[PDB]
């Protein structure tokens, strides 16, 4: 009861951060295309930690926020859900232009 | 478990106020987040069957 | 963000991850009163009323 | 046989022009909507998709 | 021209609340002449149904 | 409305720190019961 009454106090309440700490956006790249542009509208970028990125096959990734993905006809290792990344290569260069 | 899927999301709340406190976003990756947490917390060659 | 890639043989996604503080703190003032307020510092998803 | 039939639930709605009101509770509470005067959108620039 | 204006406050929760809730039966007890269903309509504080 | 917090100290993104926002009795409880019932990962 001491711990309970001491944890119900406002100034000391539980705070959690998701360990990934990343907003996950998938940008489609067709088969033969070799370039991609990510257009992001204006934002206040308050406290951005940085960028992290690989390319994942479309057939190996379920459609996000899906109760049931009817096109998902693959049952190997979803590199999106786990850390099974294998296409960190095939990345020539990258440019970032805040404006 | 259905993580980060709003259409079929989980539900945690008190009974007095049936207001769900778990909001799941399609743009967060709960499962890869747990992957990274576990990998940073310990070496991955360990086989924990539980 | 402009990317140049090696041309693969099948459609692929580019799994871009930003650096966000997708935090939450839990407010439990009384018995069976559970309330959490979320926050994601670059891409907060909260909207007005 | 009953296992050799299907179902094709469908609708047609002509001359309607689907409407999504910019109101918090999705009802009509005034022409100047509930969220049309909230100083999250009116006073701050947002880029909807 | 005159315009009616929404109440813009004290009319809709800013909290994450479900617009529409489905209840699935706790008990079924299917019988030969009927199909019973038993639910548990949980209306928490701050809700009116 | 009685707190007026800069919205980043609220979520401890730029806050003072765990050693100076938990109650001193809470910190004592965490230190005493720290060998078997951890609480550091919750703040």
């Amino acid at each position: 009861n001491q711990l309970e009454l001491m944890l119900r106090n406002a100034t000391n309440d539980q705070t959690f951060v998701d360990y990934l700490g990343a907003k996950n956006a998938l940008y489609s790249v067709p088969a033969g295309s070799t370039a991609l542009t990510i257009n992001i509208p204006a934002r206040t970028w308050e406290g951005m930690r940085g960028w992290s990125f690989t390319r994942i096959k479309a057939a190996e990734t379920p459609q996000l926020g899906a109760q049931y993905d009817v096109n998902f006809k693959y049952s190997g290792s979803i590199a999106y859900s786990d850390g099974g990344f294998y296409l960190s290569h095939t990345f020539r260069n990258m440019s970032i232009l805040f404006d | 478990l259905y993580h980060d899927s709003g259409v079929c999301s989980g539900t945690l709340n008190s009974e007095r106020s049936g207001m769900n406190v778990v909001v799941e976003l399609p743009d967060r990756n709960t499962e890869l987040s747990y992957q990274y947490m576990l990998a940073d917390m310990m070496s991955r060659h360990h086989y924990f069957a539980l | 963000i402009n990317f140049e890639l090696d041309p693969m043989d099948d459609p692929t996604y580019v799994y871009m991850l930003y650096g966000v503080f997708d935090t939450v703190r839990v407010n439990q003032p009384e018995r069976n009163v559970l309330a959490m307020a979320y926050f994601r510092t670059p891409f907060a998803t909260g909207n007005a009323v | 046989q009953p296992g050799q039939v299907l179902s094709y639930k469908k609708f047609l709605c002509d001359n309607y022009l689907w409407t999504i009101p910019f109101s918090s509770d999705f009802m009509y509470m005034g022409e100047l909507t509930d969220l049309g005067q909230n100083p999250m959108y009116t006073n701050n620039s947002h880029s909807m998709v | 021209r005159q315009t009616v204006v929404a109440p813009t406050r004290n009319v809709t929760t800013e909290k994450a609340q479900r617009l529409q809730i489905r209840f699935y039966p706790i008990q079924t007890d299917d019988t030969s002449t009927g199909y019973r269903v038993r639910y548990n309509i949980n209306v928490g504080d701050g809700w009116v149904l | 409305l009685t707190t007026a917090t800069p919205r980043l100290q609220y979520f401890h993104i730029a806050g003072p720190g765990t050693r100076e926002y938990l109650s001193e009795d809470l910190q004592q409880f965490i230190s005493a019961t720290g060998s078997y019932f951890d609480l550091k990962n919750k703040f």
Partner: peptide
Amino acid sequence: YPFDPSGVQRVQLSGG
């Protein structure tokens, strides 16, 4: 509970 009078980038307030 937090009050967030920010015109951009508000909190979620799952609450209850």
